[PDB]
Amino acid sequence: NPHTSTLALVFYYVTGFFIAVSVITNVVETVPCGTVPGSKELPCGERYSVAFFCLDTACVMIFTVEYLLRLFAAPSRYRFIRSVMSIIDVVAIMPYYIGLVMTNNEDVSGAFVTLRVFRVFRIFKFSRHSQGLRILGYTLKSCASELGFLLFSLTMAIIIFATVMFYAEKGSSASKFTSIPASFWYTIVTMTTLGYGDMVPKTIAGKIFGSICSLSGVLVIALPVPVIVSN
């Protein structure tokens, strides 16, 4: 309870801000800005490498300082570990350490982006601040079953409709429907009413089933949404 005293309030407030700092800078690390007239235009991330570097370090530091002393006052410092927010904090602050251990000295392309990614999970730490996140967590703890059925039903649909699609729009001049696992993209595009217009049937038998697919999708997704919002 931040409202317990005033220093609790200030601690809550102050940790509720470097999360925003770190997420914003994880965004900015990508925006290409600053002409760099000598060469191509650099992403601000590696251009001012030390700046975002030291800011990221400061944020990691603050988060560790918080998390540790939070861990200390825990009565059940074990259950405090199996707590959800503990997992959030640890998996948010770890990729920076493993990044330092696996710095560009020890680097490969297809395995460091997967640790560039997990920096975002720090944003969940707003859970402690706005109820809505927590309350969504709760209502998903509750509504967990219907979602399973949604998932399985969706799987059934996607399969059947992608199959009848492929078999239908196989034989054609420029069939982009070349494989069943390619007709999953199309079928989940349709059944969610998106329609990128990228893969669109072009025979007679393709259009019918694309249409029907659209309706069936409107249906299948409609099942859990009432119980979700009601809960």
Binding site: T6, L9, V10, V14, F17, C54, A58
Partner: peptide, 26 residues
């Protein structure tokens, strides 16, 4: 009430000049 809010701001500025120091230490 507000004195709590007052204590809030005075902390963040410290965290700023620290990173502003290493900005010079580049």
């Amino acid at each position: 009430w507000k004195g709590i809010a007052i204590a809030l701001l005075v902390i963040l500025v410290i965290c700023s000049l620290i990173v502003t120091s290493v900005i010079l230490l580049t």
